[model samples]
Target: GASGSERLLDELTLEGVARYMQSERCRRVICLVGAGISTSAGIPDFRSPSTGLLEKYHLPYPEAIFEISYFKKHPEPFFALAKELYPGQFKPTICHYFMRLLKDKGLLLRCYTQNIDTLERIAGLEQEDLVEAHGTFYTSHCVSASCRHEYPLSWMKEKIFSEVTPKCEDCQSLVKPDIVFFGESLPARFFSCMQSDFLKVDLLLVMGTSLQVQPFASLISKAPLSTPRLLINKEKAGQSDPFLGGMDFDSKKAYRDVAWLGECDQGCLALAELLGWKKELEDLVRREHASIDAQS
Candidate 1:
């Protein structure tokens, strides 16, 4: 019954990671999240101008607040900034809920976050699924290499709330959040998890980031050539298609690019719609709002 003049409508199956996600065959979805995820939740990102103590208290040299060398000599300024930016004060966003949904659906392999806001925990993601690449406020420790004693978060919180400089009990050295400062090294988990996980990743979802930071920025290139990569953020970034022309990772090939450019929440909403999770996603966010309200 085939005619030579007849054309195939192309009975679209699926293309790129969208098709991969739609097929329900993709079990490993890795996400790299950044400050943009928590910015909507009242958490000031590291690069934001308003985060500097100089803006609020005339603390001079806006950038020095986060410098490890500066903080070592003058801990008060950093602690002063932490008083306003501490965790437990802000709520998680729908973007966070979206990640939680992925985990709940058993599709999320891992969520590598550059944020130290700890909102992922608030969104009910298990510790096992998260890798805080920069470190977190959940713990504190002395900065001294000679006496690396840890302090309980409760102790640090008490000191932070009281607006007092935290000193190590053992060494009396300045104690700060385990966060990676300008001079500090990244958390070991970041190195360990990223090394093994990208090898098995079927899909890479990068959200709410500009992809400018070192080491972390290099992670996207580590995925296998054929692994379908998707970006959902305010802007298109690190697509790698242009580089494919000159490079020879494989002949004329790169991870299929599927980018959704807009606010993080709206992009996730669009994605959830495509994945047939619109209702579930909305309901989860509503419940999260109620819980956050109740807690407040």
Candidate 2:
């Protein structure tokens, strides 16, 4: 069944996306984001060939640093790395502001993100506006199941820099940031939010994610068939593959899919310019960064 709004666009292009945003049909915009959105702010993506975060860590096996089993035995490496990558250390990018712009316009339904960086929250998105699918450093808890005392990011930050490893006050067990590891389950909120949010999404903006991770990657296909899906990333992702769930952008039947390939920030800038929101976005970036600087 065709949604009346699916025919509102003349073509599936960035210009069409801009036009759709201005139309009444484009009310609730949902953003699905990933590490690419934060790369310009100096946070690296996890799996890039050379410049990825894993390569820079120089571990015997890079993924071990994030594996739950490995972390239980050796946590110093993760904490050492966390001290540098913690929130407040980096700034939000234009892509983040673009989502905030959607929220400000009362068009954003929710931002479902694969990032644990918490940059989206720092960018002015409220806790209610986001579903941090990978978990976050915004809060931490003791690894011990019996005494799972929670700590705020501030407490984790103070301990990470001063002590060898953060330990739970009650259990004396290792206290780790809430970021999801290889052997861990994603946050409960990620699953709960998706049950409702995707059903109402009119404009699905997917940014910077490779969309390789399961369940999270599968979210692109959850929205209504007529909802327009836009991908602004360094490369095409979720395209039809034998194993992966595809976004169907390459198929002739594709009518609501658009791919704007480039850096995430540049893509957001282009969209903002087309929507006549470039200056507003730029000003927002300036003001927010200035506030961050002043606070520091």
Candidate 3:
């Protein structure tokens, strides 16, 4: 009976998601990802406030880290945060690979992300397929806003590790990564991109996010109520609508769909089973580096 229950759970986890994906009831698929998606990547998410990696790193005056006015008076704290997030040195997890897999299956249309790690880019997502709601460490510009030149992460690294601020090439003003910070406006393309990209999506896939941040918190309102939703995370968001997959399957149960809850690493394993692509994926892994972070 225990084995039967485990088998049931496994089916609920994989076949359930596959069934939803294959359902003509919902076709266009969109993914909304966040910090938790990258936790397995070894990078720490700073938003949790409680156990967030920022607390673990014990960076001082952390409040001043993202303070816009404070950064104007003192650029020190921001640089402190950068030392950890820069270099990024981490790799993408199977979750990232899974999204790529979705792209490969021609199932995924777009991905909306609220992370700054830049792992999605490294995972091979084309710029058009992803919308980074928050900016990333890919490039740098002057915080002074009075400067004219931009710098790359490599340039910022030279200054960050040197315990000094990188300055603008033109005015010698302190330059910062272009990421959005406290009191700063979100990326310019955010809203327009959402309205344009998510307008007709039939399924909205939410993963690894706590659904705590705002503006983004309201995204669900944009999806047509008729569109089905899926949530994937270690804990329930307390805010996502139910998919009701079992008992009427819509808003009936939470994200605990043991079927769709497979770990990101086994994504190809799950997909190979669903789309019958196992041999192709295995052959590629044999030829390529079978080393996708597999969630570290």
Q: After superposition, how far is residue 34 of candidate 1 from its true place, in Å?
A: 0.9
For candidate 1, list the clashing residue pairs, or say none.
Answer: none
TM-score of 3: 0.76
Candidate 1 steric clashes: 0
* Per-model TM-score versus the true fold: 0.83, 0.91, 0.76
User: In candidate 3, what are the lDDT values of residues 24-109, reduced to their tens digit?
Assistant: 65557788888878877776676665535423334455565676777766777678767765644557776776777678878787
Candidate 2 clash total?
0
Q: Give the CA lDDT, 0 to 100, for residue 37 in model 2.
A: 97
Residues 13-101, candidate 2: write the lDDT tens digits: 99999999999888999999998999898887856766656336566697888799989998888888777655545689999998999
Model 1 regions more than 4 Å off: 1-16, 49-61, 144-149, 239-255
Highest TM-score scorer:
2
Tell me which residue pairs clash in candidate 2. none
Runs of candidate 3 with Cα error greater than 4 angstroms are 1-16, 23-27, 48-61, 85-88, 144-148, 238-272, 277-296
For candidate 1, the per-residue lDDT at 236 reads 66
RMSD of every candidate to native, in Å, equals: 6.2, 2.6, 7.1
| Each prediction's whole-model lDDT (CA) | 0.77, 0.86, 0.66
Cα error, residue 26 of model 3, in Å, equals 4.8
**Between the candidate structures 2 and 3, which one is better when assessed by lDDT?**
2
